[PDB]
A paper describes a structure:
Here, we report the deposition of 14 structures of enzymes from both the core and accessory genomes of sequence type 23 (ST23) K1 hypervirulent [name]. Targets were selected using a shotgun approach aimed at uncharacterized metabolic proteins from ST23 K1 hypervirulent [name]. In silico multilocus sequence typing of all [name] isolates was completed using Kleborate. This analysis showed that 64 of the selected proteins are part of the [name] core genome, defined as genes present in at least 95% of all strains; the other 132 proteins are part of the [name] accessory genome and are overrepresented in the highly virulent hvKp clonal group [name], which contains ST23 (7). Thus, the x-ray crystal structures presented here provide the basis for functional analysis of 12 uncharacterized proteins associated with high-risk [name] infection.
In all, structures represent both metabolic proteins and possible transcriptional regulators.
Numbering used by the authors:
A (entry chain A): 59 to 331
B (entry chain B): 61 to 331
């Protein structure tokens, strides 16, 4: 008789090994309750029905489907009947318990802090439009601007194209809003810290100072950087750790609800504003 | 079916080297084997964690560190691992697969000097970290083969802890007199040091690489191609390390040698 076990299916840890804080959080939470936990990673060359059968081989008591990058889970509808809970992803067809970041609250607290600090004309650089978080973050940004008496439709907005090759388009977008060395914005709201990286390199290389000449705000607090920005980047923490914890407890305490719970995305003010 | 038990000692503090455990899991399935991973956190303790992976009763065991270290665990706990990935055993001799830090730094510095640079500022990682001294042998050999005595160059060692990455800007500006730098290039211990270097040089009004070439190390999956211009670096072979470690168990090897895995030079546009 082995202890209770949580089976986890990671759909894309291969292309984005940053959200590993989700699977680590699950493993740590399960151990703090006398449970075990294994993780099956889905690569590109293998295929779903095989991978799902493999995690069923360990015969788990509960199952968690997770995406390292907030997505909508592109798997057969017949394979979305096994997962007791979804971590950082939502099911379009069947309704399943889901724990996702509160993208609208995160972007709102960030933009609210920026405007409150005195900025009024931010350049807004959004992530790909179809990504599920992009539209929720923009609602937060818009709500913060309207509460400050600013119509967000009057600001400069830009959407990135899908793929890391597009991070190199950011510099051209920033320089396009700079006329004869003086910028047509007093701040820059970045879809993520990788966009902030591009922004820092472009502004410093243009002879501008952060934040004396231009404030900057990122999103994610990427475990790989965040504190490496000069100056330290004001950003928003993606709650990968709380997402994994809440997902594990849902199974540990055998919950039956199938609601989509939005986890708090805390604002990390630093020195970029 | 046969199963490989993996013990990750520090994926909590450095979740970048996850490419090792992923590579192990992928290689084991390509041979009809299974594989589980036990992560050691800070709040738990070894004897408990080691007993836990023995619970799954594995056919082979791999001890791995996300950051090349010398494995700070009881000598009696280093008798179970069939192979060590990205780490070495000081006491008992155990089969180990580690990066060829000397070859990696050599190919990098060789390419830099060959491109025409002669006075690089060398920013090394903490001295006690086992790779730091091996990378410096590579750097020195490249410089001596180019007729340069590395003892005449400016060297600096970082202090242990991420808090010290913020000391890099001061070290770079200390080698700049009245706006003109006293170096024509910068050899960085890793891409995180390169990040600090880029921010400091661009903020100083210097151009990369027209005024100062820059070279990193690791090719951090999280950046590398995000540098402006794209950072010339060295790839840490986490993927090959995991693969070779899995095969050692799959094919039941008996040697207890320390194999150095190739660390390939990724030239880009920072030089």
């Amino acid at each position: 008789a082995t202890p209770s076990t949580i089976g986890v299916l990671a759909l894309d840890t291969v292309t984005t090994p940053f959200s590993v804080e989700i699977t680590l959080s699950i493993e740590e939470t399960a151990r703090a309750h006398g449970w075990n936990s294994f993780v099956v990673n889905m690569f590109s060359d293998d295929r779903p029905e095989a991978v799902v059968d493999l995690l069923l081989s360990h015969r788990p008591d509960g199952i968690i489907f997770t995406t390292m990058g907030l997505r909508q889970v592109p798997l057969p509808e017949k394979l979305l009947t096994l997962p007791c809970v979804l971590a950082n992803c939502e099911s379009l067809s069947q309704p399943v318990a889901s724990y996702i970041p509160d993208d609208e609250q995160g972007q709102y607290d960030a933009v609210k802090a920026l405007l409150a600090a005195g900025y009024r004309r931010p350049l807004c650089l959004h992530l790909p439009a179809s990504q599920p978080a992009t539209i929720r973050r923009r609602r937060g940004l818009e709500r913060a601007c309207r509460e400050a008496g600013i119509e967000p439709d009057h600001l400069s907005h830009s959407y990135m194209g899908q793929g890391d090759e597009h991070y190199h388009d950011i510099p051209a977008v920033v320089l396009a809003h700079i006329r004869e060395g003086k910028p047509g914005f007093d701040s820059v709201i970045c879809g993520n810290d990788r966009i902030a990286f591009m922004v820092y390199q472009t502004l410093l290389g243009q002879g501008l100072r952060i934040p004396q000449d231009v404030a900057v705000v990122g999103y994610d607090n990427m475990v790989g950087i965040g504190d490496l920005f000069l100056p330290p980047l004001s950003t928003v923490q993606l709650p990968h750790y709380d997402i994994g914890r809440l997902s594990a407890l849902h199974i540990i305490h055998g919950d039956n609800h199938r609601e989509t719970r939005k986890v708090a995305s805390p604002w990390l003010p630093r020195a970029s504003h």
